[PDB]
Symmetry: C6
Subunit: 189 residues, 6 copies
Amino acid sequence: GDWSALGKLLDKVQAYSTAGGKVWLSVLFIFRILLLGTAVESAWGDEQSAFRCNTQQPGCENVCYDKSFPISHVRFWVLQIIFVSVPTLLYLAHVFYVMRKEEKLLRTYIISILFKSIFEVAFLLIQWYIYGFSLSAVYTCKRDPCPHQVDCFLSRPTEKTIFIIFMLVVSLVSLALNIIELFYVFFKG
Amino acid sequence: GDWSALGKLLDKVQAYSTAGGKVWLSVLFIFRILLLGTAVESAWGDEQSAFRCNTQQPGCENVCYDKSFPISHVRFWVLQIIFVSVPTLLYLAHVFYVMRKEEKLLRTYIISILFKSIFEVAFLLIQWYIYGFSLSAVYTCKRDPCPHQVDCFLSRPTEKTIFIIFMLVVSLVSLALNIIELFYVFFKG
Amino acid sequence: GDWSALGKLLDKVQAYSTAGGKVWLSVLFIFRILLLGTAVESAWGDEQSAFRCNTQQPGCENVCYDKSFPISHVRFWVLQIIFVSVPTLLYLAHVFYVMRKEEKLLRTYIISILFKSIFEVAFLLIQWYIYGFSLSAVYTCKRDPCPHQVDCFLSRPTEKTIFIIFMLVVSLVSLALNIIELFYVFFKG
Amino acid sequence: GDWSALGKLLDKVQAYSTAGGKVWLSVLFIFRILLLGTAVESAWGDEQSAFRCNTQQPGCENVCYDKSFPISHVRFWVLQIIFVSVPTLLYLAHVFYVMRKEEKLLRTYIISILFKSIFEVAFLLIQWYIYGFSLSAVYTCKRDPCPHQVDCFLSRPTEKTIFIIFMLVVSLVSLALNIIELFYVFFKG
Amino acid sequence: GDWSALGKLLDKVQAYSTAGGKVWLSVLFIFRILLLGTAVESAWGDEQSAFRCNTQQPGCENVCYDKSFPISHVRFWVLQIIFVSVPTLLYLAHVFYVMRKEEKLLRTYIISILFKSIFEVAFLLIQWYIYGFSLSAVYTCKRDPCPHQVDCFLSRPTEKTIFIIFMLVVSLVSLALNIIELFYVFFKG
Amino acid sequence: GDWSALGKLLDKVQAYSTAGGKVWLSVLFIFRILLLGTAVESAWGDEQSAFRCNTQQPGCENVCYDKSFPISHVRFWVLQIIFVSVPTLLYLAHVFYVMRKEEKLLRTYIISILFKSIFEVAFLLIQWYIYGFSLSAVYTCKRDPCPHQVDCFLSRPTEKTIFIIFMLVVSLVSLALNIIELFYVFFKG
């Protein structure tokens, strides 16, 4: 029975944070995990199987799918959320071991927040650069196995685009909250 | 061993709520989660695979499915329930941190309830606008890949319509309970 | 460490119940959950995929399946068990909050039991009205897409019928136990 | 923190049992659950999909499968284990409530053991009567849709037969242990 | 809060064991469970579906698969690990009840270890006798449905052979550790 | 309630470790588990089913797949992470039993770290030797069943290559951290 130790550890982690910033960030993080695990996972389950191309050429469908989708949307978002969470876990464990040393910080917190914001911005920039922010029902594929210029069709472009819009909005809101936290610290300093 | 802390936190969250309103809302929320997770998830598992169209045109089936279903029913309901739960979690965490500050509210509760009711109404309006409240066995699809005007068939329209009716009724009852809670607060004030 | 609080809450819920009635009902409820989750779920997994019709008409198979099965058996039983459990959860939470008020009932218990029995009877009546209590290997389907009068075959009719018989027997036994509980209360009053 | 209450409850349940009988029965029960959940479940996953018949008749394959397998092996074993466990759970809950009454048995234990043994014997007799104790690679099916006398093939008959032999041996050993427990009680009385 | 009781029970079980023997055996057991559950399960998922034979004969593929694989590799290994674990669980529960009696062993431990070693040796001998220690890409099948002598191909023979080699090595190491434990006891006696 | 015992055990394990080394290693280990379980598992789900070859030869596709992929990428990475974790678990259990003996180390820690680094290097060398660090969309297969020199296509080569690059980078970083820990100990000695 040491529930108070967890409370003290949580308090020390969030000591240098805005009153509303930390609560909004935590709720948004839980929201993002729930949305990614529950909803978008099922939508992308049959992205390759439902993919087809208007050709008889053997092997053209999967090479055209690979050209169309260099990396899957849900796996890219999993990478994004994991890299965003990494600095938070690092800071949590670091301050926990600092507390252990004290039993027998602000600057590192700033570096962690700045790295998380940089990760958000970089992931968003890559997500925009690779394919933009929307999915088209018809995809024109030019690949070596396929003869001339072949035509292929996506699984469910509209629903995927809608979920893309939600993920982009969530990323933007998280970035804005992190920038607000940085401005709050600059106000403190 | 700090079970009493959770009880105090729960009491403070529900202090400004009707005696029957909170209990009915919590039971309805558990009921909605159980119904969504257990029953409707399986019914929509093969919505795209069982979907077929009466044509030989390559790629017509999935574009017609995408036109017919801009967003899946179960994923839309997951979005609805998550956005409904978001203000409750926000208020819970906020009042928890307020209690933490007190160790070392009504107006925000009203804003949270009003936002949850607005989310309910907006989700219901979108659900009505996109496709209505029923599913037809036969769907007429007009799309660019498909020549002229093609005919397609849904997986299991009657069972999907029945579950649509249950979800609509549950949403209506939850909205009514929230409106009753708002009227109760207006009586208090 | 507050295990005694849960014991007191459980005692207050079951205070107005027969000595053997509550134990038999709880064991039967656990039995029904285990039987539904473990056994009947797998049997109905391929109800639509294994379904086929003796025709070349596109889209006839799924419309005939939809006509044959307005709602799936396992999902209907999930609805039944959930609606049966709803009054019990309502009474549990209500008496819990009544205990919380006392820290700082019989008639409602009777209404809950009566509603649960009415739910049992109504679900059984609908289950009998829609399709009866057995499944036939051969199904004759008359639908608009299908020309004239087509013939279709179910996945595994005998095993499904056997599980139907078990679920009907369990529902009958639960209804009998609830009626015995009502008669016991009438004896008390 | 009330771990001792569970120990006292467990002691009272097993007070009227043989020293080695209860331990062997509990270990065998855990063994049966693990074997059923982990091993035999996967072997029967594709029993119907891998099933095929040497005919062009539409709908003959599934009607012949239904004739060959009135009820699946794993689901029948789940039914058997559940009905075997039911008297144990009934006795556990009953003696728990008897202890609760005492805070504010042998004959029923004998009835429970006898009913569990009768369930074992009856399930074994049905399992022998329906299809015996082995599976044949080639099955001859005579059904109304199929013309004349058709030939079908099972998924994996040898592995299924091996698992049948293990389940039969486990059932026999459990029955023997229960009979030994009954003889021990008769020695006591 | 009775964590010390579990520690005392664990100490009494391992009292008659070598200092390094028990730790190595426990780590190897966790390693075997993790390897079996995580890695080899996926490799054998499509053993029958990916199996095919170079013939047009209906039903030849599955009878040839059944001849090639009397029992699946992963299910055989599950049987092996379960039978290996059975004596350990028996001894654990037995010594627990002996401690309960004391509140109100070496020879049986030796019998348990000897039985576990015998199980290891017998399972290894059967695994060698049935098919050896490797899998061939090409399998020659002679069965009644198949005409003359047919040729079939395995799913992924090289990866399956590699995992066979790991499981054989793990079984050998566990057998060696058990033999070392037996020699240690003989040194004690 | 013995939470302090776990803290003391954790402290003794990490007593001979660098302040930042242990925290970075633990965070990287959690990161690797999350990345492997969540992201790369789905990408390799249909590696064999989506695999196809440009030939009519029966059985050529799976033999060419087996030649192309001697062992799956995700299963190889599972083997790597498990063998990396094995020395850590061995040291944990060993020091736990040493603490138990004390109630009634550095050199072994060094051997464990050195073995973990050797495992990292050996797994990386095998991963480089078998197939390198990239996947090509087109694979040329020469096998006995296939006539002359056949051509086959991978499922999703670009995404698989991207995940290969992440796993290689993670392995390199973990190896570097282990080497830094070894240099730190050499500084201590």
